[PDB]
Paper text:
conserved and function as secondary active transporters. transport proteins that include the amino acid transporter LeuT18. μM range and that metal ion transport is coupled to the cotransport of protons. of the prokaryotic SLC11 transporter EcoDMT.
mutants of Glu129 and reduced to half in H236A. different role in proton-coupled metal ion transport. does not function as primary H+-acceptor. the pKa of Glu129 would have to be shifted upwards. in vicinity to the metal ion coordinating Asp51.
Author numbering: 13 to 506
């Protein structure tokens, strides 16, 4: 009847005031959540953002990360204080049909992240081991056994394995930046919140600063990682009777989560400066993983003789594919964990990790093998580009399930009927939290129309455009109705 019954309140090791060892104990949840924010689903969009705007957008990344650190912390709080995840709180404070709508929506979000992971991992196999594109996907379907071995390890070593992947993809891209020797002064200048990133005038590669910046801000949080954080934050036993020990617990999970999401921010920065310093100006014409592979394997695309020699040897591209692999392994862990959370929390369905990863991976790979089938039927022509367009089109479910995850979190954590007058949110995080939630909801409701129109490709059929407008209006209005309904129920609880 409690979230993550297998590993809930497992190891509690606060030992008086020995703070840093205590920090070493529970440092896992923050890594498990942060590794999701390094998925390849936006890698290109950083590199692109670097080529179109050298170091300019870095500040935006920071801000985004900060906002992601905010809401995530709140989620952790809801897990730490209430001893229950966000899905159990929402489902407890609303009917079953809204919990089922939220269930299918979040399932579609983690399914989209799973599609990005299977595309990136399969392409990673196509690049490293030269496995055929169709075979690499059905090889990625075999991650259920990697989940079976994953199950017997334990969170003290699983949550450190996630750290291992994090520093794999972090050192892979940091190594190619160390070789680049970039002008770190311009990097520091870019990290400052300047007003050139809010303008609309450069328009390089069909992208203005305000467009790229608002895109980075819009994709700030992932809805499934909120439930994930609220569930894994409970894995440390807390008495819930000593205010100093629960306040300490909040400081604990906060410092952990910021320590890891900071690493994710560092990875995004390494991708932007990867697009600025490593690649030449405008050298990246194919945002696909294969386009970045050959672009990292062509000496004329880099801006340094050392990177030309190393690129001719073929080490940059292979490291890139390895980072693709290490990023593609995350959805096997966090996808099954979060999927269990929303499943047994929203619809009260107890399912094993076997059929979970089976169903999720299959539903994820169906459109992938359809895409590879059609493109390989056209002669394997534009197959990687179409895989990239599938990966980007999948990200609409995140915008569909984002408000129903950030609004109920902020409401339930701001109310004293769920946190109490002692552990509710400060008047500071009330303003910052509501501002961030409003901005993200607005930006995502804006993104709905752009992505739905993007489903029809770069060929604007005049008759299909009006249909895209009708469907977009219907979707955003339906999300408005669901949003005001959830607002009404939660505010009836408070």
């Amino acid at each position: 009847d409690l979230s993550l019954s297998d590993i809930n309140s497992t190891v509690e090791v606060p030992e008086g005031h020995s703070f840093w060892k205590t920090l070493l104990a529970y440092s896992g949840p923050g890594a498990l959540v942060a590794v999701g924010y390094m998925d390849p689903g936006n890698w290109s969009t950083s590199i692109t953002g670097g080529q179109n705007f050298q170091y300019l957008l870095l500040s935006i990344i920071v801000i985004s990360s900060l906002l992601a650190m905010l809401l995530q912390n709140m989620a952790a709080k809801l897990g730490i204080v209430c001893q229950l995840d966000l899905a159990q709180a929402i489902r407890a404070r609303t009917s079953r049909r809204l919990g089922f709508i939220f269930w299918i929506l979040t399932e579609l979000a983690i399914m989209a992240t799973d599609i990005a992971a299977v595309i990136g991992a399969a392409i990673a196999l196509y690049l490293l081991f030269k496995i055929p594109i169709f075979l690499a996907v059905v090889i990625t379907v075999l991650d259920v056994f990697l989940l079976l071995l994953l199950n017997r390890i334990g969170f003290r070593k699983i949550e450190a394995l996630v750290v291992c992947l994090i520093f794999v993809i972090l050192f892979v891209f940091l190594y190619q930046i160390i070789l680049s020797q970039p002008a770190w002064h311009q990097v520091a200048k870019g990290l400052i919140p300047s007003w050139a990133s809010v303008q609309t005038s450069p328009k390089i590669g069909g992208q203005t600063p305000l467009s790229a910046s608002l895109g980075i801000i819009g994709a700030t949080i992932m809805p499934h990682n909120l439930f994930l954080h609220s569930a894994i934050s409970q894995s440390r036993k807390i008495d819930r009777t000593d205010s100093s020990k629960v306040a300490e617990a909040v400081r604990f999970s906060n410092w952990d989560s910021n320590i890891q999401l900071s690493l994710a921010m560092v990875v995004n920065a390494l991708l932007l400066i990867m697009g600025v310093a490593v690649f030449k100006s405008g050298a990246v014409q194919d945002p696909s993983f294969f386009g970045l592979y050959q672009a990292l394997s062509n000496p004329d695309m880099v801006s340094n003789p050392v990177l030309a020699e190393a690129a001719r040897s073929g080490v940059l591209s292979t490291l890139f594919a390895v980072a693709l692999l290490a990023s593609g392994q995350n959805s096997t862990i966090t996808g099954t964990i979060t999927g269990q959370v929303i499943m047994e929390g929203f619809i009260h369905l107890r399912l094993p990790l076997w059929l979970r990863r089976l169903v999720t991976r299959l539903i994820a790979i169906i459109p992938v093998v359809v895409c590879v089938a059609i493109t390989s039927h056209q002669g394997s022509l534009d197959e990687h580009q179409a895989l990239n367009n599938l990966m980007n089109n999948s990200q609409v479910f995140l915008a569909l399930a984002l408000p129903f995850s950030i609004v109920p979190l902020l409401m339930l954590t701001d109310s004293a009927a769920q946190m109490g007058n002692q552990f509710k949110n400060t008047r500071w995080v009330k303003v910052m939290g509501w501002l961030t939630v409003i901005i993200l909801t607005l930006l995502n409701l804006i993104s709905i129309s752009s992505q739905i129109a993007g489903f029809f490709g770069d060929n604007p059929s005049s008759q299909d455009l009006l249909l895209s407008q009708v469907i977009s209006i219907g979707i955003i209005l339906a999300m408005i109705g669901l949003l005001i309904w959830t607002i009404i129920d939660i505010r009836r609880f408070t």
